[PDB]
């Protein structure tokens, strides 16, 4: 009956948030460990240890579409790397209250961030994505690794899953529930976004030029603006706020400035499934 309660990948010990369904018999040793390149699960330091000088992975699967500087990021489709994903999805679930699928992964395509040195390209986080999406779903489970939240990765990802979008021309949305993380990280970029655009453009535009320029949802670019105070409500019409004063301080605080690492387009290699 004893869950899974802590790892080790790379070189972080993690205590688990959640239940994941690792076969029984990985739950009852007092440690999971991982291979923090082809994400293997294993019982045994030793049988870990073996692993890692016979393991010749440095990187994810598939494809690797964005790189700047140290920062990459890996496509894998889970028809083609199914064991990956499989156990890429058993380790977000150790973090993740809400994500249900773990074993049937063929329908997603998995996004995986990596910070990247002289040993390989070592994992930080993810996003996973239907591959059809009729529900305008752009994000089906994103995840940080608990070492790395808060530290403007979550952005990243969340940046790079609207990037995905804009190149598909589609409004795009994450499933629902976000973590409580989530719905914080989200509002935080959407802000950042909003904020960047509303400063530079020197000519007037509605929520629905914002959307078209971002692939936010007008719903959520309403929201934003309104927590901003940056829109009001006049004649049955919504109708965005001026006042590049404001822009400037929000830009500044802490909790909308331009996070330390962003994705830069053209540094992205990527064209949409026809
Ligand atoms: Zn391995």
Not at 34 to 55: P, T
Not at 118 to 129: D, E, P
Not at 173 to 196: A, F, N, Q, T
Not at 248 to 258: D, P, R, T, W
Request: hydrophobic fraction near 35%.
């Amino acid at each position: 009956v004893k869950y899974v309660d802590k790892i080790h990948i790379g070189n972080y010990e993690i205590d688990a948030w959640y239940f994941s369904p690792f076969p029984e018999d990985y739950g009852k040793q007092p440690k999971l460990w991982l291979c923090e390149y082809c994400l293997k699960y294993m019982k045994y330091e030793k049988s870990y240890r073996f692993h890692l000088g016979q393991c010749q992975w440095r990187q994810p699967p598939g494809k690797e579409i964005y790189r700047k500087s140290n920062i990459s990021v890996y496509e894998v489709d889970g028809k083609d790397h199914k064991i990956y994903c499989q156990n890429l999805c058993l380790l977000a679930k150790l973090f993740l209250d809400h994500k249900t699928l773990y074993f049937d992964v063929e329908p997603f395509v998995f996004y995986i961030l990596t910070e990247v040195d002289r040993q390989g390209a070592h994992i930080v986080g993810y996003f996973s994505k239907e591959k059809e999406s009729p529900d305008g779903n752009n994000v089906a489970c994103i995840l940080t690794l608990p070492p790395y939240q808060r530290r403007g990765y979550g952005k990243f990802l969340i940046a790079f899953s609207y990037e995905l979008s804009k190149l598909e021309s589609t409004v795009g949305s994450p499933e629902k529930p976000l973590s409580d993380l989530g719905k914080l990280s989200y509002r935080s970029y959407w802000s950042w976004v909003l904020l960047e655009i509303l400063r530079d453009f020197r000519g007037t535009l509605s929520i629905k030029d914002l959307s078209q320029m971002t692939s936010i949802t007008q719903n959520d670019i309403i929201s934003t603006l309104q927590s901003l105070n940056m829109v009001k409500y006049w004649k049955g019409q919504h109708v965005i706020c001026v006042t590049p004063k404001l822009v400037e301080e929000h830009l500044k605080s802490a909790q909308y400035k331009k996070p330390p690492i962003t994705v830069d387009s053209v540094c992205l290699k990527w064209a949409p499934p026809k």
